[PDB]
């Protein structure tokens, strides 16, 4: 059906400090030489309230993509705290990995991210202003939400 199929996503350096870059080791396979590059994005949801707080941590092209099975590490910078609503800073949100071909998204892998203080003192009494230097990010890598879209591969 679709020329590209994602075989697996391994979440590296997890858990880790909120400031560390996201590191995904992706494995996907191409059923037939693509004429263009694949475009991958890592999107962090600052708040579920509005998409207006989505942060595209990074956008990269992968290519060339000859038919076969392939693997690469998609690394991106940690979101900018200054753009994250205080109330959504500590707790759970989501981070998305999407892939698009010829301007059309065909796959999207969402993960829940849990940002908590490891320091029991702070966990008991969280500061009004979230302290991201002391936050730990735990990508819940066991339960990935995979959504596939039907696009025109030409």
């Amino acid at each position: 059906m679709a020329k590209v199929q994602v075989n697996n996503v391994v979440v590296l350096d997890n858990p880790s400090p909120f400031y560390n870059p996201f590191q995904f080791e992706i494995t996907f396979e191409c059923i037939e030489d693509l004429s263009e590059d694949l475009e991958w994005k890592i999107i962090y949801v600052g708040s579920a309230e509005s998409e207006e707080y989505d942060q595209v941590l990074d956008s990269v092209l992968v290519g060339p993509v000859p038919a076969g099975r392939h693997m690469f590490v998609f690394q991106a910078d940690a979101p900018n705290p200054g753009l994250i609503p205080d109330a959504d800073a500590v707790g759970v949100t989501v981070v998305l990995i999407t892939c698009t071909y010829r301007g059309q998204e065909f796959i999207r892998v969402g993960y829940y991210v849990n940002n908590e203080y490891t320091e029991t003192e702070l966990r008991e009494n969280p500061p009004v202003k979230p302290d991201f230097s002391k936050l730990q990010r735990n990508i819940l890598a066991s339960n990935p939400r995979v959504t596939r879209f039907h696009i025109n591969w030409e």
Binding site: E25, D37, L61, G63, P64, G68, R69, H70, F72
Partner: peptide, 21 residues
């Protein structure tokens, strides 16, 4: 990996050339 090859597209975009399995 991270012996991974990345270049810039003709128009300055980041591009990773994947490893073949």
């Amino acid at each position: 990996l991270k012996k991974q090859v990345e270049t810039r597209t003709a128009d300055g975009r980041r591009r990773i050339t994947p490893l073949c399995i």
